[PDB]
Amino acid sequence: KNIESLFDYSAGQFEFIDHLLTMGVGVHFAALIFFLVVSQFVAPKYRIATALSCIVMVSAGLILNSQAVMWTDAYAYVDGSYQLQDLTFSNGYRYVNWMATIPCLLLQLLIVLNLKGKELFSTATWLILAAWGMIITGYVGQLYEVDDIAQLMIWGAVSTAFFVVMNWIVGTKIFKNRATMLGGTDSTITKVFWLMMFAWTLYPIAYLVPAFMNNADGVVLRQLLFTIADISSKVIYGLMITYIAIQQSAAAGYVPAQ
Ligand SMILES: *C\C=C(C)/C=C/C=C(C)/C=C/C1=C(C)CCCC1(C)C
Ligand SMILES: CCCCCCCC/C=C\CCCCCCCC(=O)O
Ligand SMILES: CCCCCCCC/C=C\CCCCCCCC(=O)O
Ligand SMILES: CCCCCCCC/C=C\CCCCCCCC(=O)O
Ligand SMILES: [Cl-]
């Protein structure tokens, strides 16, 4: 059902896909430590933002590690190529970590934006529902990336309607609330939004690889696209978020941050 099941892979394609997944594990658990240590230097207000970054690091690192073992459990090097043995690998388990990390990524954005009370719970409910609708409709489409490519596009179309609306809600809250942020972070948050528009858009590109590159090098490209998009949406993003949390904690008079 996923194009990965359709192809044999050379030794170089297979251990490259393997090396991308194990490397992502190391990067995510290496940033987990960093997000853990620096949390003390964040005021109680924004401290949850760094904990969320710790959550997504482990959430992603566990799925990447799981994708790696499954990758090496499903294929066997036979007669000069790694051939599918049993059916254990699938991208579907990437969509199940998005359901969890995306709300965490989104929640820590509203926290640094200094939203609170009725607006925090309200804005968070519409963003998560929009996200979940985006991920769910996207999961239904990739189920046909091999069988029905027409269903892939229309489900990706419905998923894009949610993606666009979600971005519009994030962008609107960003520009209407940055004047409240401290330490000059009103300039930094804008760039994070642009970083967001960039890293998040790589996923639909990877989602469409089966449509314009249906072969073994397309599977390699998709993982590469995932890896690049996955470090920028979670690691770099979480790094930009922590800096803002620290900076505002200093401007607000929190010594450990100062
Ligand atoms: C790991 C972090 C994130 C933010 C994953 C994000 C995924 C998307 C933004 C996926 C979007 C899709 C769209 C817009 C339409 C095609 C199907 C996708 C689910 C890949
Ligand atoms: C203070 C140092 C912090 C260390 C950060 C790096 C942590 C990485 C931990 C282990 C990475 C390897 C796990 C993946 C196992 C191989 C996957 C496989 O091919 O089956
Ligand atoms: C059912 C899913 C949609 C519901 C919306 C979720 C609302 C998220 C609200 C907060 C989650 C956990 C606490 C984080 C807020 C910190 C408050 C603070 O530090 O001032
Ligand atoms: C327990 C909460 C889990 C997430 C579900 C709630 C989020 C609702 C989001 C939008 C509804 C879109 C559902 C459409 C699914 C159609 C695909 C199908 O059923 O075949
Ligand atoms: Cl990912």
TrEMBL record:
It is a multi-pass membrane protein. The chain crosses the membrane at residues 19-38, 50-72, 92-113, 120-140, 152-171, 192-212, 224-246. It is found in: Membrane. Keywords: Chromophore, Membrane, Photoreceptor protein, Receptor, Retinal protein, Sensory transduction, Transmembrane, Transmembrane helix. The keyword Membrane applies. One of its GO terms (biological process) is phototransduction. Pfam families: Bac_rhodopsin. GO terms for molecular function: photoreceptor activity. The keyword Transmembrane helix applies. GO terms for cellular component: membrane. Belongs to the archaeal/bacterial/fungal opsin family. This is Chloride pumping rhodopsin.
